[PDB]
Amino acid sequence: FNPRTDQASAIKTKNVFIAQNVASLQELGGSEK
Amino acid sequence: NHAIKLLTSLFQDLQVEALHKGGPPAALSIMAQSTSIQRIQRLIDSVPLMN
């Protein structure tokens, strides 16, 4: 996994999580669905 | 630096195009509308890109 970018660390983690979800959606082509 | 940034942007649009993994090289014109793949194809044809 590539991050591809302590109080803001959680935000970064959330950002990473968000990006991952978006990526998965695109992989699934769920956007079109 | 500028060339690297432009390459990044073009390849990222090529990925937006090959959603779920889915011609001649792009002509050198502002109105030369082509597939994102053809644009990258032109760059690869012009200069060994990875090398």
Task: Give the per-residue SS3 of chain A.
Answer: CCCCCCCCHHHHHHHHHHHHHHHHHHHHCCCCC
The DSSP letter of residue B14 is H
Smallest Cα distance from A1 to chain B, Å: 18
Q: Which residues of A touch B19 (CB under 8 A)?
A: 26, 29, 31-32
Determination technique for this PDB entry?
cryo-EM
Cβ of residue A27 closer than 8 Å to a chain B Cβ: yes
Long-range contacts of B38-47 (CB under 8 A, 24+ apart): B39/B10, B39/B14, B40/B10, B40/B11, B40/B14, B43/B7, B43/B10
Helix locations, B1-51, DSSP H: 2-17, 36-46
B6/B1 Cα distance (integer angstroms): 9
For this entry, resolution in Å reads 3.4
Find out whether B40 and B14 touch, Cβ atoms under 8 Å: yes
Cβ of residue A2 closer than 8 Å to a chain B Cβ: no
